[PDB]
Design a protein around this ligand. Structure first.
Ligand SMILES: Oc1ccc(C(=C2Cc3ccccc3C2)c2ccc(O)cc2)cc1
Ligand SMILES: Oc1ccc(C(=C2Cc3ccccc3C2)c2ccc(O)cc2)cc1
Lengths: 234, 11, 237, 9
């Protein structure tokens, strides 16, 4: 029996907020990257450090440590780029037309043109951030969505995870009712939030192909960890 | 196969 | 604009009446199988299904209120997702098999090189079976894929997305109405709604992987793609 | 494009 299913809605919100990874910085050099080598070098270094926090974040997601070690590996391998991207979209929310990869690293789509194939994913991330802003997405909602991605993206690659996934749904509805939304507004916003997860999956799939292409180019050195995260997607 | 993730998930 | 004035029951009836037919393939069990003809059978089948899918889309409430340029984009983005969820729904009562056509059942053992996509479709199918997905719910999910899958990819082309979002909200209302009429408590309605929409994330994943396999099959120059499929596949450059 | 004219048909 899992401790995760005995938590209340508030306890679930508190546990997820306390597990949040910090916002990491990029290199403090103030040249704006317009090279593919300089831009992908800073993003890869950034993502490599973020992955170490993601792994320890996931262990604090309720119900995650009840899974086998293999199941934990599988879910993280499938979801890692989705989790990085929804985090990027979240903190870029208050910077319209900009992507805040780090507080000292904001990229516009004019820089995304410096890599073939990047500007297309750039615009999808931009539109996702604008969608979050127009919906007035809250932090308590964001961490529920990020946890759903971790648990759902690799389920059918199971009774326990679906029970935890239902628990997070109750938590999302709890936050909306707490915010004074009517019954009709609650289920509509629930649907609007979860349909964005389809687009987050789409962006990750396109991003994964972009990283595989960068690996074959062999100019940007990838860490062994990012290499194994990338190799997991066949 | 020995992934880095296996080690990092233990602690 | 008719779609926004429709009731939940009128919405369900409109979607059910617009359902495309289930087509047959050219499969012959006496004819020796291979690795090129079987995909040739599926390619020929998808190409004829696309013609019905287009006519189905124009009967989806709200779709024809969009401009031709937006209708093209939504179909170009969602066509493989829509084919796949139709296949998954078609295969609910055939566990361990995919019912591409009434005369073409395939298990995992056939399907050769593709097996990863096959297993994913098999899992979504058993997922629908476990949830006991209803036909009224399926036609809603399929219409959601059409309007949502390409909605996040000018001048006043923002008012076009506002109409799509409102119609999408209308489909969500219809889904809740179906579950409430089935006797589901309010908590069950929200949980089932979440469960159904999370499957759409997996359906998008299977489509992205299918597009890569079809692009590879094209560059192999063995299996000939039809003129429409070539253009539909080319949209995902 | 094939899809365009089938839609306006
Ligand atoms: O080695 C890498 C691993 C992940 C990334 C990130 C991507 C984000 C992005 C946007 C457009 C095209 C490709 C990509 C990848 C990414 C980086 C940081 C972050 O917070 C979110 C995503 C880039 C390099
Ligand atoms: O040229 C083609 C276009 C689409 C397909 C379909 C796929 C379904 C499927 C299953 C396993 C591996 C690949 C694929 C693709 C597919 C065909 C019919 C249908 O109703 C649904 C999907 C196959 C060939």
């Amino acid at each position: 029996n899992s401790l995760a299913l005995s938590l209340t809605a508030d306890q679930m919100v508190s546990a997820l907020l306390d597990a949040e990874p910090p916002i990491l910085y990029s290199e403090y050099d103030p040249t704006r990257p317009f090279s593919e080598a300089s831009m992908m070098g800073l993003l890869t270094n950034l993502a490599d450090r973020e992955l170490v926090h993601m792994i320890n974040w996931a262990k604090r997601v309720p119900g995650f440590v009840d899974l086998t070690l293999h199941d934990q590996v599988h879910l993280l391998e499938c979801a890692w780029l989705e989790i990085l991207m929804i985090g990027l979209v979240w903190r870029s929310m208050e910077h319209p037309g900009k992507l805040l990869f780090a507080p000292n690293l904001l990229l516009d789509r004019n820089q995304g043109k410096c890599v073939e194939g990047m500007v297309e994913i750039f615009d999808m991330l931009l539109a996702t951030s604008s969608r979050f802003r127009m919906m007035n997405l809250q932090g308590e909602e964001f961490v529920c969505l990020k946890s759903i991605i971790l648990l759902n993206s690799g389920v059918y690659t199971k009774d326990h995870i679906h029970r935890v996934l239902d628990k997070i749904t109750d938590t999302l509805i709890h936050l909306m009712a707490k915010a004074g939304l009517t019954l009709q507004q609650q289920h509509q916003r629930l649907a609007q939030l979860l349909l964005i997860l389809s687009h987050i999956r789409h962006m990750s799939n396109k991003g994964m192909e972009h990283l595989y292409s960068m690996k074959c180019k062999n100019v940007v050195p990838l860490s062994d960890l990012l290499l194994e995260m990338l190799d997991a997607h066949r | 196969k020995h992934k880095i993730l296996h080690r990092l998930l233990q602690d």
